[PDB]
A paper describes a structure:
Here we present a cryoEM map of ZIKV strain H/PF/2013 in complex with ZIKV-117 Fab at a resolution of 6.2 Å. The map showed that the mechanism of virus neutralization was by binding of Fab fragments that cross-linked the E monomers within dimers and also cross-linked neighbouring dimers in the viral glycoprotein shell. However, only two prominent Fab-bound positions were observed, one (‘2f') closest to an i2 axis and the other (‘3f') closest to an icosahedral three-fold axis (‘i3 axis'). The additional density at the third chemically equivalent position (‘5f') closest to an icosahedral five-fold axis (‘i5 axis') was weak. Three residues of the ZIKV E protein, Asp67, Gln89 and Lys118 (‘Asp-Gln-Lys triad'), previously determined to be in the ZIKV-117 epitope by alanine mapping, are located closest to the q2 axis (orange oval) that relates the i2 dimer with the general q2 dimer. The footprints of Fabs when bound to the 3f and 2f sites overlap. Only one Fab can be bound within an asymmetric unit, either at the 2f or the 3f site. At the 2f site, the Fab cross-links monomers A and A′ of the i2 dimer and monomer C of the general q2 dimer. In contrast, the Fab bound at the 3f site cross-links monomers C and E of the general q2 dimer and monomer A of the i2 dimer. The structure of the Fab-virus complex suggests that the antibody functions by preventing the rearrangement of E proteins necessary for low-pH mediated fusion.
[name] (ZIKV) is a member of the Flaviviridae family of positive-stranded RNA viruses, which includes well-known human pathogens such as dengue (DENV), yellow fever (YFV), West Nile (WNV) and Japanese encephalitis (JEV) viruses. The nucleocapsid complex is enclosed within an icosahedral shell formed by 180 copies of each of the envelope (‘E', ∼500 residues) and membrane (‘M', ∼75 residues) glycoproteins. A recent study identified a human monoclonal antibody (mAb), ZIKV-117, that was demonstrated to possess therapeutic potential, with no cross-reactivity to other flaviviruses. The mAb ZIKV-117 neutralizes ZIKV strains that belong to African, Asian and American lineages and is able to reduce fetal infection and death in mice.
Numbering used by the authors:
A (entry chain A), D (entry chain C), E (entry chain E): 1 to 396
B (entry chain G), C (entry chain I): 1 to 214
The structure:
């Protein structure tokens, strides 16, 4: 559960170091802990939420130019400054240009032009900082046993119904004890500040999308960048390099917009995780954690029962999984109190002997409903073998 | 959205006056205010930007001041070329709203209107419409009110008033006031009157005719 | 030297109003204009610089605009903390002259003064001087005129008027008007009158006494 | 005349070709042209006026600072920009500074300060350009003969009295012919655009003084420089470097004015000519010219006269000059029409043979006043020689 | 405290020499003394005040000239002295100049001019002497233990609170025993006359600013210098060299002011400490001292308490500092008499062994207020580790 089809599988054999088993979790995969002292517990990471981000720099995806004007003082002369050079907010470039004679003034020699243009950004891209504090995690975990195989993926009983607890982990609390009612509680300790390798990742937003960026990328990029701390009106740095003021060879110095770059930043970003967000907070998905799982208190709830009478049927037939495990659904029509279900992977029948690991721990169908389902899974040996259920002459 | 209020739509000034034009923002806009002047047939021209900075080429007679919600354009030593419409505009947030405008006109000595009344022409009375025209010419100041009466009863519907711009030489105003009614109604009454209220007389100037008299 | 004219020395405003303060330069000053506000006992504080730029920390309610000769400070959504004296200043050339100031005060409902008249005290009449005092208390608006009479004849010399600042709680004004004359002249007349002209009455409030009556 | 005491002397004696003698003139000195058959002409340069100058760049001798303010965004942000960064006209420097905890915010590693100050210049220094056009010269010239030695230096009548003339030379007219009435006219051709080596010299003004500066000096100097073309309000370049914003290991970043530099520019200028000016125009004094003097038409203002009778006296006694010439004043009481004056430098007594050059040309006292003066000068030899004046027994 | 963010850090391991640890202090930094025998004491220098300075020489930043006059005696005749040479206070320079003939007197070889000008200084710069006597110091010191982290930087109390103390050290008293109430008293011995390297530093004032200057600079500089001992009226030495009396080849000898130098002295001073004042005493800031700290009597006030119950909840979340130490705020809701606070940096979870140095000494929250704060800081090992606070199941 929260397992099987996921296809990225890690089995961790353990129950030695007093449940000291340490495990890594990756948003792609999941690790199942099988320990004789315990029912087999399925851990998977889900979403790592980041909250309380702050803005750092920003950029201009799409430049826009407004009012182009110029003046020239003829021959040697402190490039006559337009008024537009005093307001910032205007690009200006002072170049040398021939004004001969009928350009209006003697010494058709080399003069100077000063061209200026108002510069107003369109759209934007605003980095954001992510700090190890106010970092969260979400670990959903579940326990095989035999719950209804249709419940393999659900989030309705996140806080109730057999094995299924939603554990939060955030810095100021490396530990959370997940109480799975009746199985005891799985001691869980994780290092939030270590694994994900943050503080090197600025959180980045183009128009209605998101990313992550290693610093020394987003810190160094050649576009106009707002100072980022004040949203009142942009007072830019840069402001060249998204605007190329260029000339030919006569009397003119022209200016060009460059037609945003929004296609560049995309095609520029490579090897940067995708990301999504709901409001002030945002949810990455790339898992990394180092969790030392304390298996200390886990109480098998399938001990001290009888063996469920004879009346087992397959529903949907068995199947093979990935790394080679097998799953089974069994519907025990046997009307009894919650009861233990015999299952053995047998090599032939010359002598019904246990062959190969049975990893559901102890399947126990809990209902009085007289018709119930339990999904138990097991990994039989390499050669041909039987999966067997029940101990009565009605066994199937 | 931000409202920029110029409460004085019209100001009369003499050459040499200190002219004060006020602009009030409905919320704090900091110093993000521009002032323009505009003359008929032309685009506006920038005078002041970001509340207090005079644009190049603008005479030093123009100064902007203020911050927050209250902004003032001052024209010292006003000259005749400064007669124009003046507008403020804010750039704190979109939309970049303008004030309603203040039109600066020139003062001269008061002058009573010369009032003349014209019955419908015979040619118009073939049409089934009838217009009675009063011209009120060469007056100052511009504020004037015309009341029309037919056989003693005021008529407000069907009155159209048109004003010339302030004259470029004599600084006066002129106005046409035209009462339009049906020909049938026009020929059912005898007395037609236009009365002009203006500060140059304690009682209105009255021009009236009896339709059937000569 | 450049003259900066703020023609409105006093403005009455309500909270929420768009306040427009005008400054007119006697010659073109470009955008070289600052606006300040000043409260009693403090140095002025800069609001707007170079006509249209809002200084840091100033509420966005304040915006400067204009260029050339005409400058405006606009206060949008005026708040009670904006009551103050406002000044423009030009930096086009020395001397860096200020406008004359505009004092912003708050509007409330009109209120008639309560007027009380006081003959000279017996103790003052030992001195050879005699002061007759009228208090005109808790009125709005501030504009008020006091005329003194002695035995029917107006007296203008020797009148001293003093006004409180607008009250911080009730927004009214109060005034003392004191007529000082010699004791010898005071004892040669019987009737003393102070008359207060104020917009709250069509005729002045009259307080009068006869010196020798009780 | 316009000669003698000047002590920088050049004699030019090569009147060969059709009066083609070419001469150089230096505001310090003067060259006298002495040619057999032509009265000796004294040339001297006086003042070279420059007019119609234009302004190029300018600088700020004395900085002044106004309003210092700052803000800081605490570790992990950008440098929070003050409003004062949008107006130009303000210096600003963004530096890194420790804000530890009770500095108000966690992350005790390093934040950022942005300090800004209004920057308004005091006084100024404004270069000006000098072009070869609208360049003038003034050459005063005079002729020895014998005028009254008291008139050696005068200007009251540089166009009437004696044989003085004030010649102008400006580009669009390399030639000026000075008509000295009765001596004919001295053909004079000068190259104005060549000699003085202009176009490399900007004309420079500190407070109420003047200079000249080779370009590649005044073009490169490290001070705030106004663009020079518009006087409305300064929109500076530079700005820094007359203002040092400096900090000390702390929460502070301070700013300093630097106390003008006006003493530097002076002590900096070396090998730069002094200059003075009388308004829009200005008068250098350093002479250079190449003048080819045409001696063609010069009439001997002393031929076809008698010899002035006997009655010569010395007034003030003779004297020695510099390069070795001798001057003499002689007052001929002889009452006669304007008449020629015999003078001979004779080595010996009896048979008076001419010895050594007599360079006044032909001294001719012009007056009817019966008492007159004539200053004639001559260069005798080394050996004890006599200066002799007169022919009659009354000779002295 | 008075530490952490300062970022210039010196840790000085304990001294088994009987509180004989010797420490250097630099106005930039601070050294923290950690000794098992003691609570960890934070020392920092603040301001070194100098008082009772005396004036030595002075100079003239800005020269001003008044009345220029001259006379000349003609050739044979010494330089005729103006009356202005008898008053001092006047520059005078006697030069040789040609007076020829119409310069008024025979002998055209070379005369003499004497030009003189009144010389009156404007502004001034007055050195001052600093002597090792009447030298002070100010050392503020504080002790980590338990204290509102918001109090990390404050002065209101310097004579009260937990234990801060403001220690003065001046020559005639190398020692001061700082009594931090309840912690005993830190024996402190410092050599004032040695460290700062004075007697070589003149204290120097331009207009409204200050510096320090190595002697053999300020003693040798070429400007007019007042004798410094009497303020009645300046009787200068020098008085040339801020005034250049120069003249070309003519009848003139001119004189120039030089336009202060105030920009030079600034641009001249480099590597010179800038010192502010406030009247008669100037506060430098550059630290140097050799202080032998006697740790003898320091009584830990955190011994013989219980362990504060369970109710520990971090605030401001932890942070990293500079050299790698960590700070923590903890608000112990559980209220009792001052109660010792357990803190251990643990390399595990199950059995918590002490790992890495805990340097706050013994954190002890002193309040009855039932809600208190204590800032304890500690340096954990290199690898991942836990910071742990509390002993009860409620530990965080």
């Amino acid at each position: 559960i929260r397992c099987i089809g996921v296809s990225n599988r890690d089995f961790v054999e353990g129950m030695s170091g007093g449940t000291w088993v340490d495990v890594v979790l990756e948003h792609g995969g999941c690790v199942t802990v099988m320990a004789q002292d315990k029912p087999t517990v399925d851990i998977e990471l889900v979403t790592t939420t980041v909250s309380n981000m702050a803005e750092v720099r920003s950029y201009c995806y799409e430049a826009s130019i407004s009012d182009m004007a110029s003046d020239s003082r003829c021959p040697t002369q402190g490039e006559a400054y337009l008024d537009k050079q005093s307001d910032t907010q205007y690009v200006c470039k002072r170049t040398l240009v021939d004004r001969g004679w009928g350009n209006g003034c003697g010494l058709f020699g080399k003069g100077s032009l000063v061209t200026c243009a108002k510069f107003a950004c369109s759209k934007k891209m605003t980095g954001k900082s992510i700090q190890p504090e106010n970092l969260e995690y979400r670990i959903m975990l579940s326990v095989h046993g035999s719950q209804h195989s249709g419940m393999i993926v659900n989030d309705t009983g996140h806080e109730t119904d057999e094995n299924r607890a939603k554990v939060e982990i955030t810095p100021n609390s490396p530990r959370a004890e997940a109480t799975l009612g009746g199985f005891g509680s799985l001691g869980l300790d994780c290092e939030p500040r270590t694994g994900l390798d943050f503080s090197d990742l600025y959180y980045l937003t183009m128009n209605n999308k998101h990313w992550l960026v290693h610093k020394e990328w987003f810190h160094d990029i050649p576009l106009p960048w707002h100072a980022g701390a004040d949203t009142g009106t942009p007072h830019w740095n840069n402001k060249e390099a998204l605007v190329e003021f260029k000339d030919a060879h006569a009397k003119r110095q022209t200016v060009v917009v460059l037609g945003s770059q929004e296609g560049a930043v995309h095609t520029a970003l490579a090897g940067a995780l995708e990301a999504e967000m709901d409001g002030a907070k945002g949810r990455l998905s790339s898992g990394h954690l180092k969790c030392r799982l304390k298996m200390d208190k886990l109480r098998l709830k399938g001990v001290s029962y009888s063996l469920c009478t004879a009346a087992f049927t397959f529903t949907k037939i068995p199947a093979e999984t990935l790394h080679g495990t097998v799953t089974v659904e069994v519907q025990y029509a046997g009307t009894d109190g919650p009861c233990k279900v015999p299952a053995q992977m047998a090599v032939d029948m010359q002598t019904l002997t246990p062959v190969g690991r049975l990893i559901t721990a102890n399947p126990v169908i809990t209902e009085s409903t007289e018709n119930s389902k339990m999904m138990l899974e097991l990994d039989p040996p390499f050669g041909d073998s039987y999966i067997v259920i029940g101990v009565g002459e009605k066994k199937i | 959205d931000i409202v920029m209020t110029q409460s004085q739509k019209f100001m009369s000034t003499s050459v040499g006056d200190r002219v004060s034009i006020t602009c009030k923002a409905s919320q704090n806009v900091g110093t993000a205010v521009a002032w323009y002047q505009q003359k008929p047939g032309q685009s506006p021209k920038l005078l002041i930007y970001s509340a207090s900075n005079r644009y190049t080429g603008v005479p030093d007679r123009f100064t902007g001041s203020g911050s927050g919600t209250d902004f003032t354009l001052t024209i010292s030593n006003m000259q005749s070329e400064d007669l124009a419409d003046y507008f403020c505009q804010q750039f704190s947030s979109y939309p970049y709203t303008f004030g309603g405008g203040t039109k600066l006109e020139i003062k001269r000595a008061d002058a009573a209107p010369t009032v003349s009344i014209f019955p419908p022409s015979s040619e118009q009375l073939t049409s089934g419409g009838a217009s009675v025209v009063c011209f009120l010419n060469n007056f100052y100041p511009k504020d004037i009110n015309v009341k029309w009466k037919i056989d003693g009863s005021e008529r407000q519907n069907g009155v159209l008033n048109s004003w010339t711009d302030q004259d470029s030489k004599d600084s006066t105003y002129s106005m046409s006031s035209t009462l339009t009614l049906t020909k049938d109604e026009y020929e059912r009454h005898n007395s037609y009157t236009c009365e002009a209220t203006h500060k140059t007389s304690t009682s209105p100037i009255v021009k009236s005719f009896n339709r059937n008299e000569c």
